[model samples]
Target: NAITNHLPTAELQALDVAHHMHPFSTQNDFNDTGARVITQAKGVTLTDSEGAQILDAMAGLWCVNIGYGREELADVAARQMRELPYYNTFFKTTHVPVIALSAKLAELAPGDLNHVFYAGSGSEANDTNMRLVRHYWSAKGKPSKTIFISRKNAYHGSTMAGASLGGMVPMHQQGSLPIPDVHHINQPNWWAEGGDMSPEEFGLQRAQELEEAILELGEDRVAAFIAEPIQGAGGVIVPPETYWPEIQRICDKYEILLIADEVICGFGRTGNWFGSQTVGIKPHIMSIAKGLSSGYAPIGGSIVCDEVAEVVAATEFNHGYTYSGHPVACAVALENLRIIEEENIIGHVRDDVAPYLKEKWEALADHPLVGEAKIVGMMGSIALTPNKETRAPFAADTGTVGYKCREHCFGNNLVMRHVGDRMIISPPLVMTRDEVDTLIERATRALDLTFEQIKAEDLYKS
Candidate 1:
């Protein structure tokens, strides 16, 4: 079927209002309006229920690397399901797909990242990190080393452990989370936090927060330091040039195990195989998801360094999920990786598309509403500041202007995310230059619409 004849928009809206409790949504507001029903997706375009062709700029939450409408992925899943539908990788049992995928991941992963621990999604995989990282410390006779320090405004995932590790205040408020041993320091967000100091100096200052935190908490009690290479969900916050190098130095100085959460930045999303490689961080334990299978299937895994993997494997690690290594998911992910390699997707992203996108995206800073345009690889954001000269934020609560901008994107038939007044885009790695131009055009319209809305509502006066 070209497109399934699902429920009509009105009926779907009613059903959603009646039965669905949407995530990160205001229930009353959603019911009062309605949901956007996306009927079909192909390449970088999503056809809504009303048949508006919306350009998908964020690549379905920064996951769809191979882009939409790859029937080969579906075929891989079908073949695997017919051969071995499902099985538990517990109690010393194994599957071919799982075994092969693990080997492939180890091969692709840098350094000695040779061990794979599987989970169904990014949240679950990150939650697993909380346990495994601590366990690694304990096994190494540093039982007191339990604290994990991540940067502020970072987005890891939505589960309890994941949310705890994540430094988003809104998520913390909802669940009263951050169970224990998770600390957050300032992010190297030059647009938001770089005050007076040059971007380079500001980056070093932010990286030093980890050193201060380590000393305050006692280096013996600190297990690991986790961060995204480029802060993805936190408005695509790309640190200044001096950020990662200093971070790596601090990790080495403190003897802290570095865990790179490559959920949104993995699998060619960042013009590299992994964001860690792009940013030059040799992580001890890496939490990976999103593009592992290009959202073709639910699969996420943690690739452990040889030392950590050995330490955990020496004793009874004793933690995993029911579908730790589902055969079908593994098979699909393998094929996805194959497609990425065979098509030279990452190379294209690095050599051709990324530079073009960066130039065009940064030019948006010329817009009256844009403050700073930050692009790291394909992931990018335009800070919406009332005063670009001072980097002065709008005087409303967090995400107020962001919400307004997101509504403009919806109106203009584009999909871009907003994180606290920062409008961002991370299109698919497989996107062509023409597709990128279209994204930029639509995004420009969205920004213009947002400016109009803000002016009409007298938002600037407040």
Candidate 2:
């Protein structure tokens, strides 16, 4: 294999800009400012082409649970590739890797979630989920139960169906999405939308919206209620204490299948094996990916409850991906799970690092620009505001302030991300206390610098 890193940074940037079109980016922007070329990464640190050791706080788009440069995963992948590189589980066929992974996942996943329908990514898996749930209801003689009620500002995935299931307005605007029967309720973001009501009261009210929607849309037509345990790309908006229990009650009362999108919050990111466990909800199906293989291999799936699996299995179902249960990915994912189990990575996140990070992360609320600092396990976010007491937005546009602070973070060799006016971090689970200190220091500096710049530019007013 050729070494692209050997080339100069400018040359690489030029080549990349010329040839590669990046996701969620304006292509013309690269002409002025080239992409940050990362050459190597190990643990939580990334070495760019220019030799800066950048802290990867976002964990490679909120995956990389076991951190980078794990030789065990590589070895497993190589061995599996040698043995049998690729095979499909479709058409009355199964392979050893897939069988083993399914068993392991069944063991690890909570409750009656004992089945896996593999996909190449979370997006594909979510797409799988939409079809699966609709088919499931139709099979049960409830053909009218075809509508899915999702929360506004939720991030499921980016495929056509996945994006429709998600309630991101921009995505919906572009594709004219929601493709018919998908409906949206408000998110339980207390700081941004709670207004005068207490967080507890606001959460209860938001949860009630699901029930109201079910009734309004005719419960006979409602298929499932899908949501993340904690909103990830919608800026890590952790619902209030009263949220999950109320949601559970509503779903149960309505006999609605609850689908938890755990793409970001699964694999010990939220101090548990899955976000539903953390939030204490019994989901019928979970959309899983990201940390499934800790970003070492591309693999995702829908973990189905016993009832749904049994029902869906009764018929042909007529759904499967080419890479469904791919041997190499399954093998690598198995090895990743093994490493996590044997190393007690979940314990590390829950009992060790999470408590420590929480102490530091929540203290960020004292910062002038930070209105609310919220964290669950390794994922954390600080809401930037002009007035903390009122939780007011900046006079500047949404994401403008957050984007400036993100620039400062990059300058300081940190990899914090900005979502609207929120700065979010989801570092590798292997982060040490020293690394935590570094992350907080850099984040505080970025905030301070941002605050100063905002005031200087007359952008601090609400």
Candidate 3:
């Protein structure tokens, strides 16, 4: 650690490119452009090896809900590691940490979701959900209920089951994916896919797709409908007020299981303990991770409701992860939850930070490049367009102007992300009013610079 700590930025970059393969990166691309070496992070900011301080607006991949460098987490993890670094929850054996963490999750989860199944990450948890749902239905004597319906452009994870449950076409195209029996529907993304419908109507229509899909697949064959309460990686797409209510009606009407993927929306990301709660969803199973441990450790799981848990408990279940309820991870996750509750982090997001940030974040819509700004809690997004009135995309190929805008944001030290032509942000819940001001100020500058570059390139007409 000390050796790497002492290395120059250039050396670190060299070492990174020589051996480190990154996710969603073109190796040839970074080799030419070089990599930004992040040496340290504290609170909501990152320090690169070159000593530039960059504001982390994405919460380190939308996981670090409590922000970075929480000494308490470090101390708790160290103590747990020293006491009991590892333990297997298999063999009908259980540890105190695992028991305590399970209780904590049950207490935190809404509805009758009182049971927990641990995994190493969100993707693995989603895989667990996929298997668990089918298993549950089978155990209840409905062996034919094997289908899962998900939204288009949704991101669950990289694994087979997770990707199948997700609606990303590229991931499906690659691996002969979706395994089997996984169906896809349109997302409630009004800005991009709403067409001529109002957001409320569009949301209802997208939700109704699940109802139609179920009818088509035959209710006996459809197992569950899984979706992110608010799509994260697809863009910080907050559904219209009519969305969740209608979806709930359809799921209840068909007696279909509702699965909420809370990978990026849990632990105060949406101003509540869970995005499902924020969106008023009563899912039978909730896939959670990321902020479950504040990115301090890798931990994720599925919280099952009373009915599902009771049925699954009657059987062997025969599925689990090696790190499922690992003592160290469970201990750390418990402590992370402690910090979130004791610090009133969720309250802060719901009351203070979110309201302040929403005002400033929505204010960005006035920019010529920003078409429609949307914000719910600390998660927000703005559609970038050539013509704001008609919501027209740039003349350049998709992501050309968006990528330039993202680079401009990086250059301005604001960690805003671009999903095609949409710029999105999920900042730390612990951010203060001053930090919100700084984020907006830097974001505006990035927008202005991006507008200039696109105009100069004659990409303003689409």
Candidate 4:
């Protein structure tokens, strides 16, 4: 009888407002109006403080690939805690869990991506990459090859180095990042940047931007080029068919190392073991996290190709974290990977759910506000536009209609994310066909609400 008799929602909201400093949030705005406080999660549904079950479309920041409430993961953590609670992978010592996890990762990873460098989160892992890459080049007697180029709007991580490697304007503004050697080129965003060009031509043109940058910077001076297979945090921007192959060619042509940031796209989230595989990229380096442990525990790492690892191993890399490969984290990640493989989750996405989701999601392009709808496996996004016929975006300085659409999604008991005027959805890979329908239904309602609200407020009028 007392199961529900806890602190009131208002009190919980107040507590969260006072205590929690949410990531990527406007602090003043958040404090003025408190955020929704989730109490528990099971499967694809998150229970709020008031006992409402909200569908999780963003999958716990686009990382919870195995869904939620897997007791086995908790048990693995418990067992690891009992045995080896914590240990430093620093110096020469290594823990069993970390060792096993690294070996398993090597087996699963494609090509010669054998060496694993663990970090606590994607941000830290990417930060490790930033330092390690420069050091690797320096060790190979190419000290001047320090510049790293990433795509605009790519979300690598939140650490200073990660943020710098990523081309997010807001993050760069907060701190003078990119730390000198990091540079960015335009993303192959077919929705916004495509203009009057065809998808293939636009993709080819965008891919060539990397070549142009390398040329301008001098190929010998450039160390590596990083990109997300499908741009995740930048609203699931799926590049066209020509993009990845062309990028691969460019990287190969220039002999620049390719670093695929697969934090969100790894671990079967994109119907493959890695996003690089999905997009046909043979990366010399990769940043992995998020779904690594299915959000059951904090874990992430950088998988280095044989060549890079050899160079890094030859010299003292002088970079690592205390919790780089915590026993418990490794155990959970291993278990998560096991469940995914055994359950054939990737097959399910490929043969069953992905096609359905893509078909239904793409149909939303008929919506008045939708200029483009893109889906790759479970991740998807729709570009909100004022004129679809002309592919016109809303006037600058106007509040993002996509953000307003996200607010409507929240109101409708669905969790979606927004990047500028793009609405994104990355539901748990375990979602059923019916569940996908439900997700679309909710998304449609949210879009309708957003359209009505914008029209009523004259928000998008130029």
- Candidates sorted on TM-score, descending: 2, 3, 1, 4
Q: Highest lDDT, which number?
A: 2
Worst 10 residues of 3 by lDDT: 1-10
Which residue pairs show collisions in model 2? none
Steric clashes per prediction:
0, 0, 0, 1
Task: Give the worst 10-residue stretch by lDDT in candidate 4.
Answer: 1-10
As for lDDT, the candidate ahead, 3 or 4, is: 3
Tell me the lDDT of candidate 3.
Answer: 0.90
Clashes of 3: 0
Q: List TM-score per model, in order.
A: 0.97, 0.99, 0.98, 0.97
How far is 86's C-alpha from truth in model 3 (Å)? 0.4
Task: Write one digit per residue (lDDT tens) for candidate 1, span 268-329.
Answer: 98888899999998999789888999998999989989998888888887799998889999
lDDT of each model, Cα atoms only?
0.89, 0.92, 0.90, 0.88
Error of 3 at 244 (Å): 0.8
Candidate 4 wrong stretches, greater than 4 Å: 1-5, 396-399, 460-462
Worst 10 residues of 2 by lDDT: 1-10
TM-score for predicted model 4 compared with the true structure: 0.97
Please estimate how well model 2 matches the true structure, expressed as its whole-model Cα lDDT.
0.92
